[PDB]
Design a protein around this ligand. Structure first.
Ligand SMILES: CC(=O)N[C@@H]1[C@@H](O)[C@H](O)[C@@H](CO)O[C@H]1O
Ligand SMILES: *[C@@H]1O[C@H](CO)[C@@H](O)[C@H](O)[C@H]1NC(C)=O
Lengths: 43, 49
């Protein structure tokens, strides 16, 4: 049948990552997108 | 000592917040162990002179 695909491009950024007690990545906040995430990156 | 964690097939070492390696997988028998130094606690010496 008919299907679709999406293509995006990577950029150099700074990431904030957190892991749980099994090492599984559960959340991620990128900076430079809005002032609240910039505050979370700073803090 | 015997440990409790288990991780991915592409992972071998795990480190602490101070980048101290505390978890190692034994390569012969596939088990996970834990390392801790045996220098621990504080001592104090009392002298009358
Ligand atoms: C006598 C000897 O060396 N036997 C080894 C055993 O110790 C090891 O657990 C196993 C799997 O690696 O291979 C064999
Ligand atoms: C971590 O691993 C244990 C054992 O597999 C599992 O029961 C648990 O749901 C996992 N996640 C958390 C957040 O503890």
């Amino acid at each position: 049948d008919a299907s679709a695909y999406f293509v995006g491009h990577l950029k150099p950024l700074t990431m904030l990552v957190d892991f749980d007690e099994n090492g599984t990545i559960i959340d991620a906040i990128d900076c430079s997108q809005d002032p609240l995430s910039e505050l979370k990156c700073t803090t | 000592t015997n440990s409790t964690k288990k991780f991915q097939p592409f992972q071998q070492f795990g480190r602490d917040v101070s980048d101290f390696t505390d978890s190692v997988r034994d390569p012969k028998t596939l088990e996970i162990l834990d390392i801790a130094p045996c220098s621990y606690g504080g001592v104090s010496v009392i002298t009358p002179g």
